[PDB]
Amino acid sequence: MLWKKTFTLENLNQLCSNSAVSHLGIEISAFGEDWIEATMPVDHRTMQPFGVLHGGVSVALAETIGSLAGSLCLEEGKTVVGLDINANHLRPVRSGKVTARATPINLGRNIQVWQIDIRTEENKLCCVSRLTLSVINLLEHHH
Amino acid sequence: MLWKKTFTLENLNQLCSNSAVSHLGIEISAFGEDWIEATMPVDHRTMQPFGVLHGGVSVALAETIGSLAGSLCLEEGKTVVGLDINANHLRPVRSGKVTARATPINLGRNIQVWQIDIRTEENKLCCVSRLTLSVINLLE
Amino acid sequence: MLWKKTFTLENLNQLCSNSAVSHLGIEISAFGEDWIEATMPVDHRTMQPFGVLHGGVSVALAETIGSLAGSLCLEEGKTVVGLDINANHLRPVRSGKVTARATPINLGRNIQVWQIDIRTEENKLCCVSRLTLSVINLLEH
Amino acid sequence: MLWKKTFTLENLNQLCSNSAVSHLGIEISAFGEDWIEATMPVDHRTMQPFGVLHGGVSVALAETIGSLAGSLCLEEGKTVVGLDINANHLRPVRSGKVTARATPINLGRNIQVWQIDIRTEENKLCCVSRLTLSVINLLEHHH
């Protein structure tokens, strides 16, 4: 099992409240031994001005679930900071909710690399992303 | 000039109402000869739970302003589709507003590449992004 | 299956000769129903100065196998143009050959997106890459 | 200012000898206060079968010049490792030499981000790239 922190979906969702995450309707929704998922609605909150899911907001979803995932793979007292992200948009989404699944590509001492695949409710791949994170020690004095 | 469509900031801001763009408090805020800017507040709509600007939302800002810029560089009957984007987050932002400026790298017949630089109110670069768009001929 | 062109490894290697591909000692090495591989030695032709495989060169390999894979998924009279590529380097490589496997992510009408994984001799992932290609119709282009 | 190591272009070219850098005909060719350049011939060593400069080889040139630049900004005892790179290929090149310039975007304690722009001898922009580097310390014992 990948995780080093103990958590529940309910506790994760509470932590994310009052932030860009809750503001965008994003919900941490499911997890397994080595992946975790978040969903997000396609509606006026998340669409670009022509009735489709805003591609930039898709990336917001990817960075959210990947950073969360990366932190859960570290012991208490450590967490991650997003360094960079890239993504390809593969198809437009007009309705329903999308689901982003984060899976680890490499978990280093200092650097983590995560894959995030975002799929429509029809299970079609609509976005693929790769995220690079830095591992930080929370007890270091300068923060 | 760069622009092929006529537009005003008020018009552009009306086009973006009741969407992800207005939902994030993003405002199309200025433009020149070959650049255009949008602003976004750093607050509870746009921050991580832990109180810094959400880097994913900076990307949303970047894609908004670059795609808009891309469409303005095309004649009527043509538009753009977001193909890919990448970004580096350079520094944390904890308050104020940030400004994203889109400038063109290459405007081709089929493909456009745009640079987006996002800066803090202290004029510091906090995020850089490159955006690739596909040019589509709607009627033709 | 995946491929729309018939081909052999021998034919592919020959087409690639007297170019950057052969200059780098890259060889098209195996394929399956929906993936294709190339190998590349780690020696003085491909190392950066302090004795490890050069990351940029690893990306040249990725773009090589991804683009070839792309072209083999199209019918005659069609081909691909590299639009962009990105990669993460995961670990240093000091010897042997590395192997790059291309697998498709999405093959659309006008754009193809390809995944490329590069692994060492002990099957360790040393580089991961995504490549974006433009589909061109040679008969109007 | 930017540079923390003392160097000349001859030193740098000496350092790159008998490596992928020399193998590709890449030459360190100029530098200023805030940037450094390298050239590379477009010929059979560097073209793809279709007779244009190999895009992957352009990225090799970008990573080369950015990583070298990255190490030159650091005190003796420290250097860099490539973490990731991305590039867009903007136009075919079929002859002459290309020139790549690395200019820093942000230099952190642990992470550096570099811009590389590659141009043809007509000074047309043919490739833009961004490189992320990790800062390492070579002088730690033991350890």
UniProtKB/Swiss-Prot annotation, chain B:
The keyword Hydrolase applies. One of its GO terms (cellular component) is cytosol. It comes from the Bacteria. SUPFAM superfamilies: Thioesterase/thiol ester dehydrase-isomerase. Its EC number is 3.1.2.-. Keywords: Hydrolase. GO terms for molecular function: 1,4-dihydroxy-2-naphthoyl-CoA thioesterase activity. Belongs to the thioesterase PaaI family. This is Putative esterase HI_1161. It comes from Haemophilus influenzae (strain ATCC 51907 / DSM 11121 / KW20 / Rd).
